[PDB]
RNA sequence: CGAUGUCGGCUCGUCGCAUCCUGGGGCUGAAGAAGGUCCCAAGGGUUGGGCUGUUCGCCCAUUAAAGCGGCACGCGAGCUGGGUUCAGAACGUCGUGAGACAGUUCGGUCUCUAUCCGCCACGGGCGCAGGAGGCUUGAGGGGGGCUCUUCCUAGUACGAGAGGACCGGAAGGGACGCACCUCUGGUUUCCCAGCUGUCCCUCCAGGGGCAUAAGCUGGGUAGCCAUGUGCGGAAGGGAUAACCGCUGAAAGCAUCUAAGCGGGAAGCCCGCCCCAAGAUGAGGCCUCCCACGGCAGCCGGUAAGGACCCGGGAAGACCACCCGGUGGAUGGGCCGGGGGUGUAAGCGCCGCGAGGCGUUGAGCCGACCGGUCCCAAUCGUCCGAGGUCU
RNA sequence: GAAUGCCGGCAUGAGUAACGAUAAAGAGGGUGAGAAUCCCUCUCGCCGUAAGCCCAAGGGUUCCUACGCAAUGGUCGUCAG
RNA sequence: CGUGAGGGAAAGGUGAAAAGAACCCCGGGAGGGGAGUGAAAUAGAGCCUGAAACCGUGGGCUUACAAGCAGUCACGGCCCC
């Protein structure tokens, strides 16, 4: 049973899954847009949105918070100095997911894009 | 016989004569009668009750017709109470006073594919002493050449829960008419937000 | 419908507001209404609260005391009607929220681990100075 | 009750 | 929650120090004994020249358990050991003293003698 | 276990009866409102790159 | 004998009744209580231990009682492998020997994949002469069925005494069963904190990895849970068993019977709970669409409605079911509350220092109760009546 | 027409079990008819008395480069012993 | 295949003649469709004949209240001659 449980397992153990989200965040915040499988995508939204919201606080504490997942001062500088201001007046939802039309040839996996909002 | 539809909202205990008493709170009212079943017309006696207001955007024409003939706003749920004929055109929690005993029917929580141990309280297998991949297994399911088959109704693994359950003779602890609220002593089938039926008990 | 608010709305008739705030580590005296056939009297229970498990009206707290060579723990509902009053007898300072570990400790060891929470003690004397 | 034993203790083979 | 094989402290001056439950006298097949229940036990440990000696098969009533017991007023109470008091077939304490607190539930179950003799009733 | 095995060969009838559920369901498709091409619904059009009125993607 | 695996245990039962208990009786060398013995009864129940491989048996402590049998001495494609059939070794014994012994002793390979019937669950198809959306009747099934102690009646009836009821009434348990999570108590794989070694970011401070598929430790929400909580066995009607009668001949008496009529079981039928119209005997009610174009049929477009697709879901293996899809609170964010953790970082002050104090119940913070269109459920598509004949 | 016959061919079980250590993956950018699987880069993880590096046996061109993907590779393949 | 002594297979056929299919078309290729050769191309090299099991496409009749070694006897319906 799975009654009222939140969070996909994604056939990864506790730390692989952590690293999975973190690495995707590094990639999302870097290129502004990535392609993944639909399930990874939907789960990535929250993980990244939180990081953006903290960059919206902007304080030392928040930066050090974000660095725990992002681990790259430059990347976080880009987060605070270029990305975060774009959302000053936006109330959550700094990410969107749209599903692509074609599946991966090799395993038939459904694909989607995750991008940062305008 | 009298009854009402309701939703299960949650559980608490209250205090009554220096005693803690577990209650399940149920939002029962208000239920408009939307059809009456009669011996000349239907062959038996009952009252079809509606419950919870619905966006008429989602109610189709055959359903609209039914409501309209009763002069009743569109409702989400229709359900009957046999051998119940309220003098009114609306049924509320006020039909139950504290101290009355009731039967509550709901839809039990669903465990999906349940092992024979969770479902039927089988003893399962030993967990050491050589036990071989049978720790949660049911054992024998039969005999031998005679009868050379397995009985109908053999308790076996399968789906469990998400089925109609009635717990009987529950004390009505309080009723708070202004909030369409019913407080019942003990445990009621199903999850919070679950549709339930409250009937006057059949025990004595 | 807001199922949560409904439940709090039921509980609201039973909610107490007259009790002093305490934390795990504090030493407390709970005066409890007790029945003994055929009269009811007030029995005092005094000890370290070693646990406060929160759930609104349904919060309960556990108090530990060593009575006549034997350890006793009592669990009280925080909004029980059978509680007359609670008297803060001492403020202790814990570093965690549950103190089950004091069960394995000498009276001496507990005394060191649960220093008097000097801060909240000063606050206690700081109020009580009333008009 | 202990009676005879009409079969040896078994063991599985290997087809090929 | 006492069951066969459970060791109990004895909370009296009968001379027994440790009893091991061998039956809970409460129905055809009671799984557990709690405060107020009577068990049949074996005296596993005694002090020289008491009323009881190691080996005896005695009756006793449970006065304290480590498993907390619940009360209708919504509260509970729990002790640091499981203890008992040796009784006779008339449910009366065989010794003349009882040590440590006992559960108030004893009173209503007709063990007044033990309740009185007890230093504290919680 | 003792290695269960099929007692009889399955007949052409019986094997083909089993497969009476094996037909594919054709892809469900809708016209993209921009380029009128046929694509699955709720997916970015892979021909013109449009979704929800706007250009989203380079095709 | 081109194999029907053989004791005992465990698991799971199911049946018989020559009945162990509980229910109903007759006789008693039945005063009462408690027994004896036979009759009716298979609904339910029939405990935990010590010894032995044991079945059996003995013993301990209880119990209403600790029933006896069948089902390949029920059940090894369900488990075990202690016992029994191999190969090793030894003792007693027999044999010159090799070896042997319903004599003993220690050890000794138990096979991932279920085709058919059967069984537990779940769908797909078609049918139920118009097509649809709801709500139902209950043929017929299944589930359940146990029992004890104490008190009152009453220290009364009965007894010299000890002892001690019928009938009726009230309370509290044991085991079992169904549900539930308010409380008690678990778990809670990253919800919080503390700790070690190492490597790293970035030197300090602060952090990240790894030490398990959580490094370790102390806690812990929702959920799923029992040790926790609510509730069930009935009541009640009916017909009966043994058994007891009323009236009453044959047979002037007598006779429960040959006419007729009563009483009478935990058992039987209803009643309770659950499934159920594939009940092809395919039921019923309420509502909606409707008189389409072409030549009981066909092709095509629609109506009411349905499906597809999507956001989801205490629903769930897939499927199904249920909710919602911008005329929207469905999930994700965000905000408030709850809840866990237990006073973040930074700074200031104190100490030579490990640290400590204040800022501060702080900071962080899964799932719970909500709000909020910020993100996504865009845009659509395909099916779908014209009602056969007495 | 049968010999658990002999040789071959094709069925059934079945779109089933499995795809060979639970050290682990993610994204961007290239190439190409085609890419989860080939090249590049960044992030993550695993070994480190080894899962690194040297000999000897044994193997015998498998080495390097160009051009290829029918088969071999337990999938794919533009890559490869 | 076996350390070795030793064991030990399978595998024949275009056409009279290569006249072995220029050239175009789809395709990455394989493969095919036209053109062409030939008396003949389902003689197209995976090549004479090309049986059977086995797999498929199209059509006729038939099947979702029915009991079986699958046939047989009878009658009726539908399709064909
Ligand atoms: Mg699980
Ligand atoms: Mg949820
Ligand atoms: Mg989930
Ligand atoms: Mg997670
Ligand atoms: Mg993955
Ligand atoms: Mg997994
Ligand atoms: Mg995977
Ligand atoms: Mg997995
Ligand atoms: Mg993986
Ligand atoms: Mg780890
Ligand atoms: Mg780029
Ligand atoms: Mg959050
Ligand atoms: Mg997609
Ligand atoms: Mg596709
Ligand atoms: Mg592939
Ligand atoms: Mg898609
Ligand atoms: Mg009626
Ligand atoms: Mg319902
Ligand atoms: Mg199970
Ligand atoms: Mg299960
Ligand atoms: Mg499980
Ligand atoms: Mg389970
Ligand atoms: Mg169960
Ligand atoms: Mg269980
Ligand atoms: Mg068990
Ligand atoms: Mg067991
Ligand atoms: Mg177990
Ligand atoms: Mg084994
Ligand atoms: Mg195992
Ligand atoms: Mg069976
Ligand atoms: Mg049979
Ligand atoms: Mg069944
Ligand atoms: Mg279900
Ligand atoms: Mg009651
Ligand atoms: Mg709540
Ligand atoms: Mg409160
Ligand atoms: Mg409150
Ligand atoms: Mg000291
Ligand atoms: Mg101060
Ligand atoms: Mg024999
Ligand atoms: Mg003591
Ligand atoms: Mg001794
Ligand atoms: Mg003795
Ligand atoms: Mg095995
Ligand atoms: Mg066959
Ligand atoms: Mg065959
Ligand atoms: Mg077969
Ligand atoms: Mg078959
Ligand atoms: Mg066949
Ligand atoms: Mg076929
Ligand atoms: Mg086919
Ligand atoms: Mg089949
Ligand atoms: Mg568009
Ligand atoms: Mg044989
Ligand atoms: Mg054979
Ligand atoms: Mg054979
Ligand atoms: Mg054989
Ligand atoms: Mg056999
Ligand atoms: Mg046993
Ligand atoms: Mg077993
Ligand atoms: Mg067992
Ligand atoms: Mg049977
Ligand atoms: Mg039996
Ligand atoms: Mg029978
Ligand atoms: Mg007899
Ligand atoms: Mg007996
Ligand atoms: Mg009787
Ligand atoms: Mg009897
Ligand atoms: Mg009798
Ligand atoms: Mg007598
Ligand atoms: Mg007598
Ligand atoms: Mg008598
Ligand atoms: Mg008798
Ligand atoms: Mg006898
Ligand atoms: Mg009999
Ligand atoms: Mg019986
Ligand atoms: Mg039986
Ligand atoms: Mg036993
Ligand atoms: Mg034993
Ligand atoms: Mg034995
Ligand atoms: Mg047996
Ligand atoms: Mg015997
Ligand atoms: Mg014996
Ligand atoms: Mg003997
Ligand atoms: Mg008895
Ligand atoms: Mg008796
Ligand atoms: Mg026994
Ligand atoms: Mg016997
Ligand atoms: Mg038996
Ligand atoms: Mg037998
Ligand atoms: Mg046999
Ligand atoms: Mg036999
Ligand atoms: Mg047997
Ligand atoms: Mg025999
Ligand atoms: Mg037996
Ligand atoms: Mg048997
Ligand atoms: Mg067998
Ligand atoms: Mg068998
Ligand atoms: Mg076996
Ligand atoms: Mg066996
Ligand atoms: Mg078999
Ligand atoms: Mg042995
Ligand atoms: Mg030996
Ligand atoms: Mg001799
Ligand atoms: Mg000799
Ligand atoms: Mg001789
Ligand atoms: Mg011999
Ligand atoms: Mg021998
Ligand atoms: Mg023998
Ligand atoms: Mg012998
Ligand atoms: Mg001997
Ligand atoms: Mg022997
Ligand atoms: Mg032996
Ligand atoms: Mg041996
Ligand atoms: Mg050994
Ligand atoms: Mg052995
Ligand atoms: Mg073995
Ligand atoms: Mg086995
Ligand atoms: Mg295996
Ligand atoms: Mg399989
Ligand atoms: Mg099968
Ligand atoms: Mg068969
Ligand atoms: Mg069969
Ligand atoms: Mg079957
Ligand atoms: Mg089957
Ligand atoms: Mg079935
Ligand atoms: Mg169906
Ligand atoms: Mg079906
Ligand atoms: Mg009809
Ligand atoms: Mg319908
Ligand atoms: Mg009816
Ligand atoms: Mg029926
Ligand atoms: Mg039937
Ligand atoms: Mg009396
Ligand atoms: Mg007397
Ligand atoms: Mg007297
Ligand atoms: Mg009296
Ligand atoms: Mg008298
Ligand atoms: Mg007298
Ligand atoms: Mg007298
Ligand atoms: Mg007396
Ligand atoms: Mg009575
Ligand atoms: Mg009772
Ligand atoms: Mg049962
Ligand atoms: Mg829960
Ligand atoms: Mg909770
Ligand atoms: Mg809990
Ligand atoms: Mg808890
Ligand atoms: Mg815990
Ligand atoms: Mg975390
Ligand atoms: Mg450290
Ligand atoms: Mg570290
Ligand atoms: Mg470095
Ligand atoms: Mg540092
Ligand atoms: Mg740090
Ligand atoms: Mg971490
Ligand atoms: Mg590392
Ligand atoms: Mg680590
Ligand atoms: Mg490492
Ligand atoms: Mg860690
Ligand atoms: Mg907890
Ligand atoms: Mg807790
Ligand atoms: Mg929890
Ligand atoms: Mg329990
Ligand atoms: Mg009756
Ligand atoms: Mg009657
Ligand atoms: Mg009668
Ligand atoms: Mg008479
Ligand atoms: Mg007469
Ligand atoms: Mg007469
Ligand atoms: Mg006469
Ligand atoms: Mg008669
Ligand atoms: Mg006659
Ligand atoms: Mg009668
Ligand atoms: Mg009478
Ligand atoms: Mg009864
Ligand atoms: Mg139905
Ligand atoms: Mg129904
Ligand atoms: Mg029908
Ligand atoms: Mg129905
Ligand atoms: Mg139907
Ligand atoms: Mg029939
Ligand atoms: Mg009808
Ligand atoms: Mg119908
Ligand atoms: Mg009807
Ligand atoms: Mg209706
Ligand atoms: Mg018209
Ligand atoms: Mg029209
Ligand atoms: Mg016409
Ligand atoms: Mg049409
Ligand atoms: Mg429509
Ligand atoms: Mg869906
Ligand atoms: Mg789903
Ligand atoms: Mg579910
Ligand atoms: Mg679906
Ligand atoms: Mg819908
Ligand atoms: Mg739409
Ligand atoms: Mg719209
Ligand atoms: Mg709106
Ligand atoms: Mg929402
Ligand atoms: Mg929300
Ligand atoms: Mg989700
Ligand atoms: Mg929140
Ligand atoms: Mg909050
Ligand atoms: Mg809090
Ligand atoms: Mg501080
Ligand atoms: Mg600080
Ligand atoms: Mg200073
Ligand atoms: Mg200084
Ligand atoms: Mg300084
Ligand atoms: Mg302050
Ligand atoms: Mg905060
Ligand atoms: Mg806060
Ligand atoms: Mg949750
Ligand atoms: Mg709340
Ligand atoms: Mg929420
Ligand atoms: Mg929007
Ligand atoms: Mg709004
Ligand atoms: Mg049409
Ligand atoms: Mg006519
Ligand atoms: Mg042949
Ligand atoms: Mg022949
Ligand atoms: Mg064979
Ligand atoms: Mg054979
Ligand atoms: Mg042969
Ligand atoms: Mg042959
Ligand atoms: Mg062959
Ligand atoms: Mg499949
Ligand atoms: Mg299979
Ligand atoms: Mg499978
Ligand atoms: Mg394999
Ligand atoms: Mg598989
Ligand atoms: Mg592999
Ligand atoms: Mg493998
Ligand atoms: Mg393999
Ligand atoms: Mg593997
Ligand atoms: Mg693998
Ligand atoms: Mg793996
Ligand atoms: Mg690791
Ligand atoms: Mg993997
Ligand atoms: Mg690329
Ligand atoms: Mg290109
Ligand atoms: Mg690739
Ligand atoms: Mg490729
Ligand atoms: Mg790539
Ligand atoms: Mg790869
Ligand atoms: Mg090293
Ligand atoms: Mg090492
Ligand atoms: Mg060489
Ligand atoms: Mg080689
Ligand atoms: Mg080569
Ligand atoms: Mg070169
Ligand atoms: Mg290749
Ligand atoms: Mg290839
Ligand atoms: Mg290829
Ligand atoms: Mg080539
Ligand atoms: Mg390949
Ligand atoms: Mg391979
Ligand atoms: Mg290439
Ligand atoms: Mg290359
Ligand atoms: Mg190679
Ligand atoms: Mg190379
Ligand atoms: Mg070789
Ligand atoms: Mg070789
Ligand atoms: Mg060679
Ligand atoms: Mg040839
Ligand atoms: Mg030639
Ligand atoms: Mg030629
Ligand atoms: Mg080309
Ligand atoms: Mg081309
Ligand atoms: Mg070309
Ligand atoms: Mg290529
Ligand atoms: Mg070609
Ligand atoms: Mg060609
Ligand atoms: Mg020619
Ligand atoms: Mg020509
Ligand atoms: Mg010619
Ligand atoms: Mg030609
Ligand atoms: Mg040709
Ligand atoms: Mg030819
Ligand atoms: Mg020729
Ligand atoms: Mg040919
Ligand atoms: Mg051919
Ligand atoms: Mg052929
Ligand atoms: Mg054919
Ligand atoms: Mg066809
Ligand atoms: Mg055909
Ligand atoms: Mg029929
Ligand atoms: Mg038919
Ligand atoms: Mg048939
Ligand atoms: Mg037939
Ligand atoms: Mg036949
Ligand atoms: Mg005829
Ligand atoms: Zn388009």
Distance between CA atoms of F30 and F39, rounded to whole angstroms? 5
CA of A106 to the centre of ligand 251 (A): 29
E55: left (phi over 0), alpha (psi -120 to 50) or beta: left
Beta bridge pairs of residue B165:
B106
Question: Which residue bears the tokens 């459904």?
Answer: A110
Question: Which residue bears the tokens 């016209």?
Answer: F31
Distance between CA atoms of A41 and A95, rounded to whole angstroms? 10
CB proximity B143–strand G (7 Å threshold):
yes
Residues 6+ apart with CB under 8 A from B50: B31, B32, B33, B34, B67, B72, B75, B77, B78
Q: Measured between CB atoms, does E10 come within 8 Å of chain C?
A: no
How distant, in Å, are the alpha carbons of A56, A94, B38, B84, E121 from that of A88?
A: 7, 11, 65, 61, 65
Beta bridge pairs of residue B199:
B3, B103
Chain B residues whose beta carbon lies within 8 Å of the beta carbon of residue A5:
none
Burial bucket for residue B143 (CB in 10 Å: 0-12, 13-18, 19+) = exposed
- CB under 8 Å, gap of 24 or more: what pairs does B138-141 form? none
The pair of structure tokens assigned to B93 is: 């929690």
Spatial contact of B60 and B35, defined as CB atoms under 8 Å apart? no
Residue of chain A nearest F51, judged by CA positions:
A98
Q: What is the nearest nucleotide to F19, using C1' and CA?
A: H15
Asked how this structure was determined, the answer is X-ray
- CB under 8 Å, gap of 24 or more: what pairs does B85-90 form? B85/B36, B85/B45, B85/B47, B86/B2, B86/B33, B86/B47, B88/B33, B89/B32, B89/B33, B90/B30, B90/B31, B90/B32, B90/B33
Give the DSSP letter of residue C96.
Answer: S
Q: E111 in helix, strand or coil?
A: coil
Question: Which CATH fold topology does A14-118 show?
Answer: 50s Ribosomal Protein L17; Chain: A, (3.90.1030)
- Kindly determine whether residue A3 and residue B112, on different chains, have CB atoms separated by under 8 Å: no
Distance between CA atoms of B93 and B2, rounded to whole angstroms? 11
Distance between CA atoms of B91 and C61, rounded to whole angstroms? 42
Residue B173 CA, chain-centre distance (Å), reads: 19
Distance between CA atoms of F24 and F14, rounded to whole angstroms? 20
Spatial contact of A2 and A47, defined as CB atoms under 8 Å apart? no
Q: Measured between CB atoms, does B143 come within 8 Å of chain C?
A: no
CA A55, A56, A57, A60 torsion-angle sign: positive
CA A35, A38, A39, A42 torsion-angle sign: positive
Beta bridge pairs of residue C42:
C33
Phi, psi angle pair for B34, to nearest 5°: -120, -15
Question: Which residue bears the tokens 């990244």?
Answer: A48
Distance between CA atoms of B167 and B203, rounded to whole angstroms? 12
In chain C, which residues are followed by a C-to-N distance beyond 2.5 Å, i.e. a gap?
none
Residues 6+ apart with CB under 8 A from E82: E2, E6, E7, E8, E9, E62, E64, E65, E66
Residue of chain E nearest B14, judged by CA positions:
E74
Distance between CA atoms of B66 and B34, rounded to whole angstroms? 8
Protein residue minimizing CA–C1' distance to G21: E28
Cis check: omega of the bond before C89, within 30 degrees of 0: no
Q: Measured between CB atoms, does C84 come within 8 Å of chain E?
A: no
CB proximity E112–strand G (7 Å threshold):
no
Type and span of the H or E element at A96: strand A95-103
Q: C127 in helix, strand or coil?
A: coil
Distance between CA atoms of A76 and A66, rounded to whole angstroms? 8
Question: SS3 breakdown of chain E: % helix, strand, coil, rounded to 5?
Answer: 10, 40, 50
- Kindly determine whether residue C37 and residue E107, on different chains, have CB atoms separated by under 8 Å: yes
Bases in strand I with any atom closer than 7 Å to a protein CB:
54-56
E3: left (phi over 0), alpha (psi -120 to 50) or beta: beta
Distance between CA atoms of E50 and E14, rounded to whole angstroms? 6
Question: Which residue bears the tokens 């005391």?
Answer: C65
CA of A51 to the centre of ligand 8 (A): 29
Nearest to E22 by CA among E39, E46, E44, E45: E39
Residues 6+ apart with CB under 8 A from F3: none
CB proximity A88–strand G (7 Å threshold):
no
Spatial contact of A25 and A69, defined as CB atoms under 8 Å apart? yes
Phi, psi angle pair for E22, to nearest 5°: -125, -10
Distance between CA atoms of B142 and B154, rounded to whole angstroms? 9
The pair of structure tokens assigned to B155 is: 């308790």
CB proximity A71–strand H (7 Å threshold):
yes
């Amino acid at each position: 049973m799975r009654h009222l449980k939140s969070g996909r397992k994604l056939n990864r153990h506790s730390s692989h899954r952590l690293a999975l989200y973190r690495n995707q965040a590094k990639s999302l915040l870097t290129h502004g847009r990535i392609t993944t499988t639909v399930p990874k995508a939907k789960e990535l939204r929250g993980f990244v949105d939180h990081l953006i919201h903290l960059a919206k606080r902007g304080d030392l504490h928040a930066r050090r918070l974000v660095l725990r997942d992002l681990q790259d001062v430059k990347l976080v500088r880009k987060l605070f100095d270029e990305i975060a201001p774009r959302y000053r007046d936006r109330q959550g939802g700094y990410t969107r997911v749209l599903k692509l039309a074609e599946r991966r040839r090799g395993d038939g996996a459904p694909l989607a894009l995750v991008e940062l909002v305008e | 016989m009298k009854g009402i539809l309701g939703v299960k909202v949650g559980m608490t205990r209250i205090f009554r004569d220096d005693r803690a008493v577990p209650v399940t709170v149920i939002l029962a009212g208000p239920c408009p009668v939307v059809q009456r079943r009669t011996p000349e017309k239907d062959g038996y006696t009952a009252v079809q009750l509606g419950f919870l207001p619905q966006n008429p955007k989602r109610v189709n024409r055959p359903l609209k017709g039914h409501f309209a003939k009763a002069g009743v706003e569109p409702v989400r749920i229709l359900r009957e109470i046999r051998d119940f004929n309220p003098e009114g055109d609306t049924v509320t929690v006020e039909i139950f006073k504290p101290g009355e005993r009731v039967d509550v029917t709901g839809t039990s929580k669903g465990r999906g594919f349940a092992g024979v141990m969770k479902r039927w309280n089988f003893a399962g297998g030993p967990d050491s002493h050589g036990a071989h991949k049978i720790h949660r297994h049911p054992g024998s399911i039969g005999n031998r050449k005679t009868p050379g088959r397995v009985y109908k109704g053999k308790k076996m693994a399968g789906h469990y829960g998400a089925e109609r359950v009635t717990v009987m003779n529950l004390e009505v602890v309080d009723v708070i008419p202004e909030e369409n609220l019913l407080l019942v002593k003990g445990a009621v089938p199903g999850p919070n937000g679950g549709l339930v039926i409250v009937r006057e008990t059949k025990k004595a | 419908m807001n199922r949560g608010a409904l439940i709090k709305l039921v509980e609201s008739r039973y909610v107490r507001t007259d009790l002093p705030e305490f934390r795990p580590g504090d030493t407390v005296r709970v005066s409890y209404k007790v029945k003994e056939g055929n009269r009811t009297r007030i029995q005092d229970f005094e000890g370290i609260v070693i646990r406060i498990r929160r759930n609104g009206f349904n919060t309960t707290f556990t108090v530990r005391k060593v009575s006549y060579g034997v350890g006793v723990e009592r669990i009280f509902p925080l909004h029980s009607p059978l509680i007359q009053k609670i008297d803060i007898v001492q403020r202790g300072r814990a570093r965690r929220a549950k103190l089950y570990f004091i069960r394995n400790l000498s009276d001496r060891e507990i005394r060191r681990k649960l220093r008097a929470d000097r801060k909240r003690i000063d606050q206690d004397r700081a109020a009580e100075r009333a008009a | 009750v202990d009676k005879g034993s009409y079969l040896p203790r078994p063991t599985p083979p290997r087809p090929i | 929650m006492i069951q066969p094989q459970t060791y109990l402290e004895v909370a009296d001056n009968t001379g027994a120090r440790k009893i091991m439950c061998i039956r809970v006298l409460k129905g055809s097949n009671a799984k557990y004994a709690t405060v107020g229940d009577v068990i049949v036990a074996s005296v596993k440990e005694a002090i020289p020249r008491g009323a009881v000696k190691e080996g005896d098969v005695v009756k006793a009533v449970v006065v304290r358990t480590k498993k907390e017991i619940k009360r209708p007023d919504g509260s509970a109470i729990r002790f640091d050991d499981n203890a008992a008091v040796i009784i006779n077939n008339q449910l009366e304490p065989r010794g003349t003293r009882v040590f440590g607190p006992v559960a108030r539930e004893l009173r209503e179950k007709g063990f007044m003698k033990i309740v009185s003799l007890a230093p504290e009733v919680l | 276990a003792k290695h269960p095995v099929p007692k009889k060969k399955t007949s052409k009838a019986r094997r083909d009866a089993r497969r009476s559920h094996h037909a594919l369901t054709p892809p469900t498709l809708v016209p993209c409102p921009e380029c009128k091409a046929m694509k699955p619904p709720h997916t970015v059009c892979p021909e013109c790159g449009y979704y929800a009125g706007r250009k989203v993607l380079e095709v």
